[PDB]
Amino acid sequence: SISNLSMQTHAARMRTFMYWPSSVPVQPEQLASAGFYYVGRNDDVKCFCCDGGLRCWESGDDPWVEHAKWFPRCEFLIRMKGQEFVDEIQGRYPHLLEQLLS
Amino acid sequence: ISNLSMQTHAARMRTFMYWPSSVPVQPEQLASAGFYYVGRNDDVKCFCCDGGLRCWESGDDPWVEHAKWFPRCEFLIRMKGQEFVDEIQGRYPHLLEQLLST
Ligand SMILES: [Zn+2]
Ligand SMILES: [Zn+2]
């Protein structure tokens, strides 16, 4: 089941990036593709499905890889990228929680 | 070892001089688990992994919580063994997941 039903369509999530800051390296179209919509503060985004938030976007960052890095059990992510992809990314970062708790 | 001067059990109990009497976990249970008081609220850190714990509600086990949040702690494993750590880890498989929902 979905966390934000109003942002289920690409068109809608993509509609929120109207005043997405120019200095942010990642583009609104990659973000909307990954299910992320702009919450209207700084560069904070949320996924319409898992309600998982992401911020501090830097050059090279991949919305799909980050989605799998931080919210691996999101139904939408699995369905679009597959369990293999999620397993691989989760494979790269086994000590994520530990690293947060430093 | 993060804090060499909190190595001994006796040095650890000493930091609980200004420990609040309202917090329902005694300095004894906390010093045995490797924790010393850092002087603010009820924040404690382990002399080894430097893991920090707070918000001690009633019925909390310093050893269980050590295993819960800092399972790779050498001191925790030496005192309680890898089996205890695995058991508590299985009781909480989605720990990082529950953090990021807030
Ligand atoms: Zn998601
Ligand atoms: Zn420790």
Author numbering:
A (entry chain A): 254 to 355
B (entry chain C): 255 to 356
Q: Please, what does the article write about this entry?
A:
The suppression of caspase activity occurs in the presence of specific members of the IAP (Inhibitor of Apoptosis Proteins) family.
The divalent Smac-mimetic heads bind to both cIAP1-BIR3 and XIAP-BIR3 in the conserved IBM cleft, between the β3 strand and the α3 helix, roughly lined by residues Gly306, Arg/Thr308, Cys/Asp309, Glu/Lys311, Asp/Glu314, Glu/Gln319 and Trp323, in cIAP1/XIAP-BIR3, respectively. In both structures the two heads of the ligand adopt antiparallel orientations, with distances of 17.0 and 11.8 Å between the N1 atoms of their triazole rings, for cIAP1- and XIAP-BIR3, respectively. Surprisingly, analytical gel filtration assays performed on cIAP1-BIR3 did not show any peak shift in the presence of an excess of 9a. The resulting chromatograms showed for XIAP-BIR3/9a the same peak shift observed in the presence of an excess of inhibitor, and a peak shift of about 1.3 mL for cIAP1-BIR3/9a (from Ve = 12.9 mL to Ve = 11.6 mL).
